[PDB]
Symmetry: C5
Subunit: 311 residues, 5 copies
């Protein structure tokens, strides 16, 4: 089978539509997501025209192998989609209505700068390559673009699923390509981060600050070094769920800042002890008393500055 | 092959049934489970009718390709099910009895609010899309819905496997869809959580409380900070088996509460030491003596309040 | 093709045999194992009979598609087996001899009560379904049941591979089903558990007991709390290799018992220190001297009691 | 179908091209990467020649099965590529233009000597085996070698994608084999390693150095041994993302050097305490004061020496 | 198609050869490895003979379906191999030359007794089952056995790839089977184990030994118990890469021995402190001074004894 012949010199228009049934497995580290959807296609093939009076039926059903079907592929997939043709229906004028249900692992890059208070635009790029006989162009049938109400992406809020109606038509290896951008806007459910990571980090940080009400070096060393070990466990825990970015993320900046605070508290603890040994407890007492206010105040201001830069 | 033609303008009823052979791999983090079952379908095709006295046979066997079979799919599957047709049998009136065995990975959301004392209703949604010729509707043959006695879901108790007999009939992309809800009611086997997680957590908490019978700051700091590190290990261990929820879970609340108790015990330990250094051991002794009763009493009351709110 | 017709009203006997080539991946947490074996089938089809004299051949070879073959399935598989037909041979009387080589992931539940000094009976359930035309029944050809001498299941000893010769005949979805039970008896290689888990746990427990020869609270607190952290690491290590059971396991009981012993040693350490501070070292010295004998004696007796209850 | 017959005794030239659509999953431990690309092939088949005047067409389209296509494979793949033929086009002189889209998991060894500041040359080896009738040889059509602008390999910078235009011809089992080398030059995005691993390691090392301003053996032991435990966590964290190399890596050298520094600081801490006990604090004070300068100076010089040897 | 008929009563000889293209994923815990190779087969089929003068051709090419091909399988594979026929060529006398490229996951047991200074012999077992018409026997064409120069197994040195030329001919389920053993000799690149595991273990052990130059029980307890925790981290790290063996490994013996040394050092530390409290520092001083020599000497001798027993 060859493609439909043109009436004039016009390109063949393939109307497309994606209807999302399921969204699952948004892997942050891998920058992938899995999708289960309907792919709807429509184009005119005059060669397929029929008289319903003679044929006995008002719509004709076909098997994919029986007729010409445009080779539509996804740009940003790991492997080619797993597809099952649901229906192929030809109307008397030769208007073909193709419908398949597919599943695919989509590659879509993420912006982690504001993580975990971040939002993403996931893309599904539909493409068609023009044949040597006639040029093929993609179009969006908005009445056939949507998502199921139930569609839940664990840990995310689905804002919208829309398509950029104008295809990107460009040459690639001496032939025309027609590319459509289907965009799924999502925002992270930051809730869990607060009681599970943020608040535990603060509690252990405040525990380390009790060293500012102690003159016992051995106890102070235990407090600061032990809380530092607990903090490292949280840093590893957090970083394992993120990919290695060539930029600073909000979480990353906070983690880095906390290390500085632990480092400076060791300096304070060390300085205070050195003075007490040098028989200067009056000078050490001045530093500690200052540390009691300075550490929370600088912690609060540094965080305001960070939140300002990132948001 | 085309669908059976109607006698009048009635829709074509497909009687369904799912008989569970196996249930395995209930992944809490992924909110998925695997199933191995029988799918039974039944509908009337008058074109397939015959006379038993003339044919000599009471039942006719067919190959799937030989006759029309309705395209039945699962809504909440990762990939389309792996299926093997077991038998196709036609009765003299043209009643078709189809049976396949399939395996599938089902996406079903879980409510972790009461975890590990939660119960769940897992769903298997059966769907059929109507054809241009006639509308297809789903039905439940209760005599063909069930599960094998051996069916064991590791760490769960299977309460019941039933179907909501009334299908959800709705339009989707200008065609009728008929959806059936199969519900598998399960309850978590909480036994293991008690000796493996709950009791260890209490033991380490009680060890931290021995600091209320000590005047040794260095020792107290060691007790509270070391037990805190052991608690963190349990918290990480527990939370790794759960997904990130946009709500508080029972376990989450408990873990948060324990952090507060560790934080308050550091305050007590710090306050007591500050007073002893300020040459006020009488005041410190009053606080410690109070702490010995206050901490267990507030721990017990806070837990009663929590259990009340969640159950 | 239809099934062989009966001479009288007798059922169709399918003689079966499984010959194990490989056993691998016994996943305890998943309660699964992989198997690579030969499945041998044999039945009489009178339609396939011939005279060896006029044919010139003593045997005829066929392609699966050419003749009727019984649809034999495994009950307890994840997905349907991956099979390759090795040979199909017909004798003059029409006795068919079928042979395939298959690989499959088998679901078989395990009893962890005596872990890691446990033994298991793994099952492979063979099943055939009857047809309207006739009743199909399974049988065991003992001369065709076995295993390769090389068959090694990593961490297990293979005791025996036998079949329960009488099939279980029952109705399922208004048709008779013939089920055969192939049982593989295995016993765990407990060797490694002794130097890698059991002995390390004892060594760290004995290190905690050196606190009974010390009056130094700070040192005692360090000993008991640090060894407790090492034990927790071993507990996590062990429990990660086991599924969550609704019953107590031997290992679980031991782990629980060790927690009690650590808890009681903290009480002793705390009590002893409280008395020394209260200017009662004579009373503390009596308790500590008693603890030196009491702890090992109660540890040994509790273990004898546990081993008695489980074995 | 047989291969095109030679005009004289010349080998058959197959012009190749690879156009990268996607690059993902560069696994360092596994030394693999996944690729989604276009494979373009071109060769002359005189048997397929035609007159454009008589036929009325300027280009003929064929199905893969209809004509002879060279068996082109990849040398360094896990499994054979997943390929879908996009188009086959013949020009009047019989010049065939084949295009497929494939996905493949490529095995390419990496040099970890300068990690995490390393660069790699990933290879895709294309191969063809000569047939009994004629010798096949590969060529590069540079106009058909490229990559999509969007092509992003998470954590890497893509420098260039080129092909070594002269094939590596050789005999394998008495047949000519023409092999092409497609090279993808990449360089690691080392940014994240600085705040996430390098700077934390320095901070904990500097914390251990505060022991040079303390006379308290107990506190010194705590400082050095606790920071050592934090460093081992980072060492394990780092080494888990790398395979076991038969050579020293930059990172591994640094990790080893840090262990020596921790070891030497324990010697200092031990020596200082031994002298204070031997009533020689003046001698100990000399060593500590020296250590305060010696440790940072030797640390800085050793690092310059290391960076010099590796870069 | 049926097998070639014999001239007399001789068995049909199938000459085999395996040429390794790639070796990857040697999983120690799973005792598996992946292979990508050429499988070459050769046998005589007199029915396929022709005259090279009359036919004008020296060689005839065939499609697998066109002629009889022996069913050759691998014994020790997970699933049946993924194969692609490269070429089938017949010479005038009817000598068939078959070549396929395959990929497979091979199950081959490993001896961990000398780990990580161990060597292995990996096996690939080729098998053929005799047909009822005649017996099939395997042979090795040494000119077609080999490996690619590039073949790299990460962390291993490939010593040799040879075949045991005499097949093992035996009866299995009332038919003859011919089995060939292809052996791949490999040795572990033990380099990395020295700086990454062995030397860190020694450094932390030597740190624990500084307790023999200290009279401070609290500090000693901290040194020995903290270094013990670091050792446990390395033990877990090591043993996670190994399967559970029914024998002692070199590594396992060393790890066990180190536990004893830590246990004995706790006894020393405890004894020394007990004496100092009992006002016997002179006796304690004698024990530590002895320990300073005894511990390194016994450590060195025990290791020589161990290395002797294992190598
Ligand atoms: C009388 C003292 C009351 C203590 C109240 C502490 C409030 C902490 C609030 C945390 C909010 C989240 C920032 C936390 C620093 C640690 C507090 C040290 C207390 C020292 C007590 C000194 C004895 C006079
Ligand atoms: C120590 C760490 C302190 C972290 C504080 C949270 C960061 C934050 O305040 O994050 C901010 C984000 C919201 O961002 P947005 O409004 O959607 O950005 C769009 C802004 N533009 C378009 C104008 C640039 O979350 C919140 O609503 C804050 C709720 C979390 C409070 C945590 C309390 C503890
Ligand atoms: C003579 C004292 C006996 C101690 C018995 C302790 C019972 C603990 C029961 C736990 C039940 C689960 C709640 C646990 C707090 C720690 C107990 C501190 C004991 C202090 C002893 C003081 C010396 C007079
Ligand atoms: C420290 C925290 C200790 C946790 C205590 C368990 C929580 C609980 O009491 O959970 C309660 C659940 C039962 O819930 P249900 O009856 O099925 O809910 C349905 C209720 N409605 C429909 C009326 C709302 O478990 C139990 O039977 C408690 C047994 C576990 C005891 C653990 C002891 C330690
Ligand atoms: C502290 C931890 C102590 C652990 C004791 C091992 C448990 C045990 O002794 O387990 C029992 C197993 C054997 O079980 P069985 O004979 O097959 O049971 C069937 C018995 N009936 C039919 C009479 C009920 O003994 C062994 O061969 C293991 C010996 C290992 C010694 C461990 C030394 C440390
Ligand atoms: C007056 C004291 C100032 C302290 C400033 C410390 C600067 C550290 C710069 C790190 C840069 C990254 C190298 C770090 C060693 C630890 C510093 C010990 C301080 C001891 C204070 C003694 C009291 C007189
Ligand atoms: C403590 C350890 C300190 C580690 C220092 C980084 C190693 C380094 O200095 O690495 C050097 C590499 C660049 O090397 P290259 O471009 O690949 O060499 C090719 C050069 N030729 C062509 C002449 C051979 O990158 C950097 O500029 C690293 C900046 C990192 C800053 C680290 C701050 C802490
Ligand atoms: C003057 C003492 C110099 C110390 C040199 C230490 C050499 C260690 C060599 C390790 C080789 C790898 C075996 C290591 C034991 C720890 C050494 C304790 C030092 C005690 C110093 C006492 C002060 C007189
Ligand atoms: C003279 C004392 C010799 C010590 C020998 C210790 C034998 C341990 C045998 C373990 C068998 C496995 C049960 C272990 C408890 C720790 C032993 C504490 C020793 C205290 C010494 C007091 C100084 C007089
Ligand atoms: C404390 C731990 C010390 C570990 C010592 C290594 C064990 C060993 O000496 O292992 C020995 C193996 C070599 O064995 P082979 O010659 O191939 O065996 C075949 C021998 N037959 C056939 C005669 C029986 O490794 C080596 O080349 C040793 C180099 C590693 C030194 C590590 C130093 C730290
Ligand atoms: C998640 C699970 C292992 C767990 C953690 C913490 C507390 C509890 C109960 C008390 C809710 C619990 O069972
Ligand atoms: C998991 C396994 C290695 C284990 C842990 C703890 C105790 C035992 C026996 C003695 C029950 C044991 O073998
Ligand atoms: C691999 C990586 C995370 C890393 C670890 C340790 C040291 C270095 C530098 C100093 C070379 C490093 O970048
Ligand atoms: C796991 C392996 C690399 C290893 C660990 C511990 C000890 C050794 C030697 C000394 C036997 C060792 O080779
Ligand atoms: Cl696709
Ligand atoms: Cl489905
Ligand atoms: Cl099966
Ligand atoms: Cl390939
Ligand atoms: Cl050559
Ligand atoms: Cl050649
Ligand atoms: Cl195979
Ligand atoms: Na088509
Ligand atoms: Na301490
Ligand atoms: Na059909
Ligand atoms: Na059949
Ligand atoms: Na072809
Ligand atoms: Na064949």
């Amino acid at each position: 089978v060859s493609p439909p012949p043109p009436i004039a010199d016009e390109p063949l228009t393939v109307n497309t539509g994606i209807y999302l049934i399921e969204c699952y497995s948004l892997d942050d580290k891998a920058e992938t997501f899995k999708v289960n959807a309907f792919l709807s296609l429509s184009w005119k093939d005059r060669r397929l025209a029929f008289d319903p009076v003679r044929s006995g039926v008002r719509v004709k059903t076909y098997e994919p192998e029986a007729i010409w079907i445009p080779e539509i592929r996804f740009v940003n997939v790991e492997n080619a989609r797993d597809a099952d043709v649901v229906d192929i229906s030809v109307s008397p004028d030769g208007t073909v209505q193709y419908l398949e249900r597919f599943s695919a692992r989509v590659l879509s890059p993420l912006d982690f700068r504001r993580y975990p208070f971040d939002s993403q635009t996931l893309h599904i790029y539909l493409i068609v390559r023009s044949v040597d006989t006639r040029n093929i162009v993609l179009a969006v049938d908005l009445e056939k673009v949507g998502k199921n109400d139930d569609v839940f992406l664990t840990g995310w809020d689905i804002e919208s699923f829309t398509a950029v109606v104008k295809p990107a038509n460009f040459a690639l290896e001496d032939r025309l390509e027609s590319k459509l951008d289907y965009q799924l806007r999502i925002s992270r459910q930051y809730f869990s981060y607060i009681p599970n990571i943020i608040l535990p980090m603060l509690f252990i940080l405040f525990i380390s600050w009790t060293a500012f009400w102690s003159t016992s070096y051995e106890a102070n060393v235990t407090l600061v070094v032990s809380t530092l070990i607990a903090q490292i466990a949280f840093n590893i825990l957090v970083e394992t769920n993120l990919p290695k970015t060539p930029y600073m993320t909000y979480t990353g900046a906070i983690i880095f800042m906390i290390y500085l605070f632990y480092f400076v508290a060791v300096i304070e603890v060390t300085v205070q002890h050195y003075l007490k040994v040098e028989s200067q407890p009056a000078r050490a007492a001045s530093i500690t008393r200052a540390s009691r206010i300075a550490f929370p105040v600088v912690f609060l201001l540094a965080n305001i500055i960070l939140a300002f830069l990132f948001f």
